[PDB]
Design a protein around this ligand. Structure first.
Ligand code: ZN
Ligand code: ZN
Ligand code: ZN
Ligand code: ZN
Lengths: 108, 103, 149, 100, 152, 100, 149, 103, 100, 152, 108, 100
């Protein structure tokens, strides 16, 4: 299928998605897609895979927890095809600068 | 039958990175090191030996963390590795207190 | 042959004392020193560290941007105390640093100083007990390019 | 993924920086004695880190200087220094199974 | 939630390779350097080390009083080799030393040099494998008075 | 009491482990604890037991107690039933060093 | 002296095979037998067991109220199979039972039968591999008063 | 150099309770045994030896469970203890597969 | 809280029910040999359950019958039977610490 | 969520008591019973067992060919004692036996009897402590042919 | 204080109750009360104590999980002083019969 | 080949471990593996190494191989350089039983 880089394709993989309570839609929206095995979802932008969700685990923060570098998430430019780019822009984590001494580029 | 021991024994200095290198730090999540440290402590600190515990903190910092600085490609996708100089003389464990007596 | 169990050959540190022990965190975020830009979210390190430590039965206590002289007051005090009733002691430090030094609010300093407040001869309540120092110092200057796997 | 070029190193040298290393003329150094003693005793059974811990224990506990001509250097002590940056458990495993 | 088993998160070093790996011992006993009195029974350290190591399945090899330049030949060689078939590598050193340096037959040298022959970028057959350096250097200068303990 | 070699021998009454040299063993600072085959050194407080049919009293004493004042040949209150005997039996001489 | 590593002296079972192995659960809830009242929520045992097992990489398969003869078909089959490619095998059983017996849908039976389908001589693909049988049988008749602590 | 082994080795029968005793079972949560079994498996099954694993399943059933039957006081506040007859000849662990290669 | 009166028992008897127990006239039973062998070798170091496992391993692997007058009873095998209901880890721990 | 440390959830048996505990060995070698041929070197089992046990800090005590009635005297006694100061208790038995029974000097008997002297309700000094019974009984009747394995 | 057996007294202990998100009220209602130490709550009817709550852990089912016998919870008669007895009657778990062979008293 | 005692001795050429009876060791089915001090039995395939200065060849062979056909005195292809020597050296006689 016109493959996974498109948000559209990441959603169509969540067909037969168990775990009713969890936001199938927005989850796939943040680079996640169903592995079709239990509730394992994988990120197409960092290759992480996550499963066994408690009834409050939020898709973004939990993605962040297990993948602190994910290019999509830290907001690097990537092949992401956003079904709704404006939606992402609000949903995504703020902005994470990385430092190692001073290099005035933080809140400089 | 009385014995003596080095005054400089039982110390442990587990500082962020190998000497002469940078220490990376996310502005909105804290340092690579502290993140991995806490992560392990509240996850194993009770169950695990201190040395092997720190090993996994080393594993975390080394494996899970790239720099990601897209404005400064020269400092981008960089790596970090902690440095655990130890001179403990026995196994540290954060044990509790348990037993269960009798009638 | 086989030598008896001297128990000085105790396989593990005794960590069942009346209480865990003291844990002093030194959080630096702002500096009087020039060019030293403040540390971003060095606090959020602190919260977490505090959290996990207290969950580890520790007696946690924290000090914000301390002038070097203060640090030493603080340590010297802590050091002169009856640890005979505690498993050990831990100190942690958060700030910038260069090769061989660590920064206080006002100045850099080699940690070899604080280190020496706790040697058995200077602090016997801890003689045979473990002293733990963790540091988050940007200490150093070179970068690591790494290797792909 | 990528990993530090400076990871998986282990430097376990004789004594804390800026200190002497004691050595018996007719039995070798405090350190090597304790090292070998532990390796050929646990090296197969034990984790590398805890292994070295006991080598530290040996050097620190079992060894005084004993120099009766030089009382200033007499009944002195020594403690090794194991700066580590391994990222997993080292064990000197063999190879065993038993099929069917 | 819970992340999958990445196996890069392998809990232990893989030590089941075709063979253990190389183990180079550097025994110094005599020095061209002045005032450097020879090392007594530094050999008997060597024998023992050799012994235990070989019993540990290692490929042990030893070098007596080496001029510094030789050491580097030896390392550079060892380093440039296919370790892909071995669990790791170990080097050991026996001689005098001062704070920040180690002595060869002819000169002192900071070990930071040999260290750097094995970094992953300079030696990928060992990239991800453990490199072990043990030293018996009189390195330092101060003494430790110690502290007496309660009977045990 | 025990400082005399004579007294160290008279403690080996009812000494099990036939094969082992009761006499010379006691001679090198060892004496029976009267419990299995545990012997203790009066000059370093070490105690050793479970002996294989070749474990030599001196080298095994040395192994578990690398500093024993009597053994490394420091001057001690030892009352040698035969001082000349000791002089030959004892380990040679172990100097300790740390630089030059 | 010291004997070499025979590797038949393998300290652990080899559990890295191409796959875990088969896991057959026998859920009984209803019985043709008289006076045998049905088992309440014996299913919910099943779900959980299934769950945890599959999370353990097992090849799980379940059988509801089986007449005894069926059980044996099922086992005999399972037993005659190439386990050489799997770590082991596990069977579990849920139903009533008395001292020395277990109930099928239609009759009681001593388990010594099923047991014997897997002995090395009758099933070498598993020779040297572990066979695990778990039972939830009301097997027995006496009660346990316990002791306060 | 060829050897033989008992045909009856490597079996493990871990059934609910000591012979000649009842097996307690909650109508709406399943049996004491299965509850404790699953609980341990999905909690340690990966980390733990099979024998010690089952020990804790024994601990669970013995410690955490009283009968509670307020209509039949004779069957009330009763206890249960599993029965793990084993003849394994090595350590069972539910290991996975991990390594991490090189460049 | 309360606990089963029948908990914390361990019956580790020689062989699976309904089978023979082999025994060397001049070395004792397969079982006792392997038992002692393990106890005095691991009993201090090891968990009771895994300990017995290795006693099972010993009896099962290291022992054939060898009865050359009675081929019907020759080259036979044996396997112990460890029915357990302990509720925690048994270890033969000692007492150690080292103060200050 | 997460429940607190109840310490009744102690991961291990407490084995640091004032002393290990009693260990009673029952050595049978001769029998009044007919056709029961004496046990060869059943003693040498005993010595070894005794040895290792005492090395394990146990309070070891042994009983030779005991008439059944004696065994019970012995147990009943042992059982009625203050074990509150000991880690546990162990009994061992050496003799012939058939399926479901064990022989005394004079008669067979199912061990279910001795077993019951130590249940928590009958012996609380041991309530929560481990009771260990080892048996070397020819108990059973069938033979095991075994299975040959791949070289190793 | 006119002690803990009263639901009223179990609530007044939740003063200075951290963990905002969690239902302070109904939690105390089911035999739980604050230990005044982190988020550790203890049941007065079975002595259980529970802490570290994820953002969906439900007070009843989680109480049940760690205490399968709790007299209050399995619905034995206890000294409980229900601020609202009708509230409890709906909130509490259904009914858990215990069996061991047949003893027709289940869905007999 | 090895079935002959003669051939089992000629393998002990370059035999380290001076103290140990090269001759009689090979005599009891043992032969040098030519690797350290590992000797293997040709009659049961056992291999043993690291010998303490009293480990006796027979009892230590027996310890690690309780069934060895040669040792328990089964009839085997053994070619005894001195059959009478063996007859005295070998362990007595070990009957195996299981009821009466
Ligand atoms: Zn991602
Ligand atoms: Zn001495
Ligand atoms: Zn409750
Ligand atoms: Zn042989």
């Amino acid at each position: 299928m016109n493959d996974l880089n498109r948000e559209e394709t990441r959603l169509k993989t969540f067909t037969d998605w168990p775990l009713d309570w969890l936001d199938k839609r927005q989850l796939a929206q943040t680079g996640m897609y169903f592995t079709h095995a239990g509730d394992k979802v994988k990120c197409f932008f960092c290759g992480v895979e996550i499963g066994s969700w408690e009834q409050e685990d939020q898709p973004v923060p939990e993605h962040q927890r297990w993948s602190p570098n994910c290019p999509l998430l830290r907001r690097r430019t990537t092949n992401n095809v956003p079904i709704n780019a404006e939606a992402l822009d609000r949903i995504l984590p703020p902005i994470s600068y990385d430092i190692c001494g001073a290099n005035d580029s933080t809140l400089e | 039958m009385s014995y003596k021991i080095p005054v400089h024994a039982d110390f442990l200095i587990a500082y962020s990175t190998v000497p002469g290198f940078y220490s990376w730090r996310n502005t909105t999540r804290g340092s690579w090191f502290m993140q991995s440290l806490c992560a392990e402590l509240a996850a194993n600190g009770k169950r695990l030996d201190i040395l092997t515990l720190l090993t996994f903190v080393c594993q975390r910092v080394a494996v899970d963390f790239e720099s990601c600085t897209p404005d400064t490609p020269e400092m981008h996708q960089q790596k970090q590795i902690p440095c655990i100089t130890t001179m403990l003389t026995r196994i540290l464990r954060f044990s509790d207190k348990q037993l269960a007596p009798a009638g | 042959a086989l030598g008896s169990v001297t128990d000085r050959h105790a396989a593990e540190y005794n960590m069942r004392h009346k209480n865990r022990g003291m844990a002093l965190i030194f959080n630096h975020e702002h500096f009087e020193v020039p060019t030293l830009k403040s540390r971003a979210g060095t606090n959020v390190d602190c919260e977490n560290l505090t959290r996990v430590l207290k969950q580890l039965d520790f007696e946690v206590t924290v000090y914000k941007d301390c002038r070097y002289k203060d640090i030493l007051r603080t340590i010297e005090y802590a050091a002169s105390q009856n640890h005979s009733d505690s498993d050990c002691i831990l100190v942690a430090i958060l700030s910038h640093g260069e090769m061989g030094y660590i920064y206080a609010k006002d100045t850099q300093y080699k940690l070899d100083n604080i280190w020496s407040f706790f040697t058995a001869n200077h602090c016997p309540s801890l003689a045979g007990k473990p002293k733990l120092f963790f540091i988050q110092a940007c200490q150093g200057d070179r970068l690591d390019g790494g290797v792909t796997m």
